[PDB]
Design a protein around this ligand. Sequence first.
Ligand SMILES: *[C@@H]1O[C@H](CO)[C@@H](O[C@@H]2O[C@H](CO)[C@@H](O[C@H]3O[C@H](CO)[C@@H](O)[C@H](O[C@H]4O[C@H](CO)[C@@H](O)[C@H](O)[C@@H]4O)[C@@H]3O)[C@H](O)[C@H]2NC(C)=O)[C@H](O)[C@H]1NC(C)=O
Ligand SMILES: *[C@@H]1O[C@H](CO)[C@@H](O[C@@H]2O[C@H](CO)[C@@H](O[C@H]3O[C@H](CO)[C@@H](O)[C@H](O)[C@@H]3O)[C@H](O)[C@H]2NC(C)=O)[C@H](O)[C@H]1NC(C)=O
Ligand SMILES: *[C@@H]1O[C@H](CO)[C@@H](O[C@@H]2O[C@H](CO)[C@@H](O)[C@H](O)[C@H]2NC(C)=O)[C@H](O)[C@H]1NC(C)=O
Ligand SMILES: *[C@@H]1O[C@H](CO)[C@@H](O[C@@H]2O[C@H](CO)[C@@H](O)[C@H](O)[C@H]2NC(C)=O)[C@H](O)[C@H]1NC(C)=O
Ligand SMILES: *[C@@H]1O[C@H](CO)[C@@H](O)[C@H](O)[C@H]1NC(C)=O
Ligand SMILES: *[C@@H]1O[C@H](CO)[C@@H](O)[C@H](O)[C@H]1NC(C)=O
Lengths: 46, 109, 177, 177, 177, 111
Amino acid sequence: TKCQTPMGAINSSMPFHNIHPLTIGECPKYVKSNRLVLATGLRNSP
Amino acid sequence: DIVLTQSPGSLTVSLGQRATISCRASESVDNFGKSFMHWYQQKPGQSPKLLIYRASNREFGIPARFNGSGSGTDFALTINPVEADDVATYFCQQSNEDPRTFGGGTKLE
Amino acid sequence: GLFGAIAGFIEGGWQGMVDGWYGYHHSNEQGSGYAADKESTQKAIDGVTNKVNSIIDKMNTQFEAVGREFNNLERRIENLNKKMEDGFLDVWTYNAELLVLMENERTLDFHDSNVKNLYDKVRLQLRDNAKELGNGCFEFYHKCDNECMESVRNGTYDYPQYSEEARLKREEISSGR
Amino acid sequence: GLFGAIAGFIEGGWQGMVDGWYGYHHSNEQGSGYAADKESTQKAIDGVTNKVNSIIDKMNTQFEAVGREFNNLERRIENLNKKMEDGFLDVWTYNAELLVLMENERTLDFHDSNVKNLYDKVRLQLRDNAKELGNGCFEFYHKCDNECMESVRNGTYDYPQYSEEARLKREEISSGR
Amino acid sequence: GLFGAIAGFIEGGWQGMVDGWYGYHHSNEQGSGYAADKESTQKAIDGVTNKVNSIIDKMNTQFEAVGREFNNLERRIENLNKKMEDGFLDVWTYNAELLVLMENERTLDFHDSNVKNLYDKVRLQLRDNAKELGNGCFEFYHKCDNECMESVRNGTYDYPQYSEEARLKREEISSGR
Amino acid sequence: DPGDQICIGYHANNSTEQVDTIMEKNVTVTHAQDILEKKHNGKLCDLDGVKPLILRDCSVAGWLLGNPMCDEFINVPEWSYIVEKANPVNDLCYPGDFNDYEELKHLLSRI
Ligand SMILES: *[C@@H]1O[C@H](CO)[C@@H](O[C@@H]2O[C@H](CO)[C@@H](O[C@H]3O[C@H](CO)[C@@H](O)[C@H](O[C@H]4O[C@H](CO)[C@@H](O)[C@H](O)[C@@H]4O)[C@@H]3O)[C@H](O)[C@H]2NC(C)=O)[C@H](O)[C@H]1NC(C)=O
Ligand SMILES: *[C@@H]1O[C@H](CO)[C@@H](O[C@@H]2O[C@H](CO)[C@@H](O[C@H]3O[C@H](CO)[C@@H](O)[C@H](O)[C@@H]3O)[C@H](O)[C@H]2NC(C)=O)[C@H](O)[C@H]1NC(C)=O
Ligand SMILES: *[C@@H]1O[C@H](CO)[C@@H](O[C@@H]2O[C@H](CO)[C@@H](O)[C@H](O)[C@H]2NC(C)=O)[C@H](O)[C@H]1NC(C)=O
Ligand SMILES: *[C@@H]1O[C@H](CO)[C@@H](O[C@@H]2O[C@H](CO)[C@@H](O)[C@H](O)[C@H]2NC(C)=O)[C@H](O)[C@H]1NC(C)=O
Ligand SMILES: *[C@@H]1O[C@H](CO)[C@@H](O)[C@H](O)[C@H]1NC(C)=O
Ligand SMILES: *[C@@H]1O[C@H](CO)[C@@H](O)[C@H](O)[C@H]1NC(C)=O
């Protein structure tokens, strides 16, 4: 990998991860959140 | 397949001089910023021996006379000064991409 | 929502308009159909795309924990190390989560704005050559064939060309038919 | 403010409408009166309530100072401890103060929006069956009794049913007598 | 942008109006000219000025690095000191940059709002005594001299006073010329 | 008789993707973008090229001092990171203490 965690490696393009804060390598940035989703499209009807 | 071609095939060098063996890769063997080339020494009549890993660093217990050099498509094992117990055939092998491929090998006299 | 167009005076969207975020439904003698304003939709895509990159980019530098070990009589600095590192994780998590929540509102209202503005673009083109029906639709006072529809969709609508026909219908409308 | 309704084209509010944030004043032969719009008022309440809760909730994890003591030759880590703990108090305070300032603006404009949108709801129902007076009020071209008033307030206004009576008045009105 | 006015239905601004951000161009027999709306321009200036001061002021307390030195066997606290101090520089840098970006959007959308609202102040005054042309301009159905222009710009336009002259003109227009 | 019509409108689909907002949770949207990675592969790996020095039941002390049970690590090649168990069985076989042990471990974080 480009990124290793004490629980395992990450292979990801995402800007964030929530695996473990102590990483080495070229990693995403750790946050405590369970869920992070940006809106891109618009509000869905039904 | 990454075809590895060593040159020259056979090299005779005077004692106490410089042996310079080359390697040329069909495609690069060189990502993550490091070169994934390796040099191996086969003294006659026995199994091959590990000299250099990732193209530049000596394996423990290898004399400094061995200069691993190169980057990308072409590399070079430099033995200097050449000693008596250096008669062997030298191999370069890449690990950048299966299937693991070796050089033809270069015999030193 | 804020601009009152999406899930407002236009109630619900069109499953059958697949080639864009905003667009038109037309209905005349030659049939009916969906279309899209590519250009407005594109500005939205450009906008939202820049927004997502801008979020990613500003969060690029950000605290990165490191392991340090401490012995049984360095408990105070060990705690200070923990709390310090936790402290930043909490801060960045707050920054990140709140950024997401806040920009979502902006993004959704952005779209709502985009649909209103498009409607208003059309509204001020047609004027009294069409009748505002109130649900997002216009009912023309004149005949508008497929060429004419395209002219409306592209800002090309010629008001003078139909104004005579429009005023003639209103005249029949005043008479009661 | 942003939407130009609260303290804009509607100048000042109604001290006399107590059972909601937004609503109607009507006036006809049968009397006059105030009436809240329940659904818009409720959406506002849902929104502001969720908003205030979200603020409380996001500030739930957040730096918590702890006391640690240090002796007279641990001044550097004692200082490092102070500046660290102060550093976070300053950050959270900024985050908290700035969140409040930004969300107040959003809240006030939210209301402004809600009102414009309520106004536009009536506007696109009535159309030319009423005259836009410019002050937040509509004057009907036809008689609108207590039953009819309720129909406007709740989405049920039938335009076709009155459209005939309306067009008849405008005719008298247009000639000047 | 969001309100569709600046670089929207009013396409491009006036190089020749120097004494304000928003205002009027009028045109009649007696000539033409530009004129700033003092009150909106002042509110905008008041608005942006308070905003900038509020930004400066909230960033007033904020982390201030201090030099501390450490010896060759205090590598762990030297690192913890470094990362901590860097940790705050990053947070504040994020805070400053993101604040600028979010408020620039708000500022630009603020102006867009101000122009829409100014246009709408004129629109709901004139009503059908003038014709909405769709480009930011109104064409009067009656003669409006330099004095009358001023009355519109400052809130004083009397609709009943011209309403008679307007309806007479609309009749000629209906005949077709 | 009815007249022609043009409507302005917007995209809908069968997405059940959901975003949160300050005023409203679980808003269902036409399109969305996840930005959190929650998945890993559960293994310790080579990092860019380089295998880590995975000590097994040896400790960092155990390794450097060369506890007999740590013979596997007598002469290690370049490594990318070191991995140490919470409580290595093979540490200071002869009881004692390792001075500035943590400060030394800190030095290893750079080697
Ligand atoms: C939104 O408001 C609309 C306007 O009120 C409602 O529409 C109305 O619904 C009923 C239809 O059944 C009706 O309203 C009643 O209100 C009158 C008040 O004076 C009442 O007098 C009428 O008759 C009543 O009394 C007589 C005897 O005196 C009985 O015969 C009747 O059965 C009744 O008890 C009248 O029924 C209106 O007809 C109708 N409005 C219009 C304009 O037609 C909507 O129902 C409301 N929507 C919702 C969702 O609440
Ligand atoms: C907004 O500006 C308006 C234009 O100046 C102003 O209305 C004007 O006020 C008085 C009405 O009594 C008149 O001013 C004088 O102008 C001529 C100068 O040649 C005199 O000969 C007149 O007799 C008159 O006294 C203007 O006629 C009048 N203009 C209009 C269009 O009504 C308003 O007062 C201003 N608004 C406020 C709140 O002050
Ligand atoms: C969302 O799903 C529904 C149901 O699966 C789709 O409705 C179908 O539409 C097709 C043609 O558009 C019909 O042939 C099917 O009979 C419909 N299904 C049912 C159960 O009636 C709908 O088209 C889907 N929307 C999108 C955008 O894919
Ligand atoms: C938003 O929607 C999610 C997903 O439907 C909800 O998460 C569920 O929460 C309930 C109890 O609150 C659980 O029983 C479910 O198992 C959860 N779903 C999942 C997929 O984990 C969430 O509660 C909703 N939030 C709000 C505020 O309505
Ligand atoms: C290997 O050869 C290169 C190129 O001549 C030289 O610069 C380098 O110093 C040599 N490396 C060693 C370890 O002698
Ligand atoms: C809109 O129509 C005009 C005139 O027909 C044309 O020049 C222009 O390219 C069209 N734009 C699009 C996006 O189709």
